[PDB]
Amino acid sequence: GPGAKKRKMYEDILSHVNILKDMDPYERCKVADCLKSKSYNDGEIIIKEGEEGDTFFILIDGNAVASKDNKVIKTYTKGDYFGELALLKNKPRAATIKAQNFCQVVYLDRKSFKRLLGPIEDILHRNVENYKKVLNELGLDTTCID
């Protein structure tokens, strides 16, 4: 794992991540104990639409942008999350997410995501349903949602 050191930094970060706000401190500590970190350079693809996905991300520093069939669907900043949909639906990545500067993320693999973010699955599902608004506005496929 991280070590007592990184682990407390992770817990600091998670206390300000909106998607985890309904967790209690015990639950967030469990998430922190399993996180890993990595970085992306400007222009690098973090998630490519159509590929298989096994990783959940929280963006902890930087700026990234999501697009689907060459239309911009979301801008991302510190505290945002992405990459949950492939894990929840067992489908290919639904959008491409690209770094627009030097980006730092923390991440979980599929099994850890399901176990550790179990406490908030209702919130994750509601937010998945909410993706439909922009997809329909832009005339994009919504079967990736349901």
Ligand X SMILES: Nc1ncnc2c1ncn2[C@@H]1O[C@@H]2COP(=O)(O)O[C@H]2[C@H]1O
Q: Which of 20, 34, 64, 73 binds ligand X (CB under 6 A)?
A: 73
Interface with ligand X, residue 34, by CB under 6 A: no
> Do residues 55 and 108 lie in contact, with contact meaning Cβ atoms separated by under 8 Å?
yes
- For ligand X, the closer of residues 94 and 117 by Cβ is 94
Which residues are within 8 A (CB) of 122 and not within 5 positions of it... i.e. 6 or more apart?
none
| Alpha carbon 110 to its chain's center | 12
Beta bridge partners of 22: none
Neighbour-count burial for 59-84, b at 16+ CB within 10 Å, e otherwise: bbebbbbbebeeeebeebeebbbbbb
Please give the Cα distance from 120 to 70 (Å, whole number). Answer: 31
- Segment contacting ligand X (CB under 6 A): 6-14, 16-24, 26-34, 85-93? 85-93
Residues 87-106 interacting with ligand X (rule: CB under 6 A): 93-95, 97
- For ligand X, the closer of residues 9 and 128 by Cβ is 128
Q: Which of 23, 31, 32, 53 binds ligand X (CB under 6 A)?
A: 53
Instruction: Catalog residues that contact ligand X under the rule CB under 6 A.
Output: 47, 53, 66, 73-74, 82-86, 93-95, 97, 131, 134-135, 144
Q: Which residues are annotated as a binding site for 3',5'-cyclic AMP?
A: 24, 26, 83-86, 93-94, 131
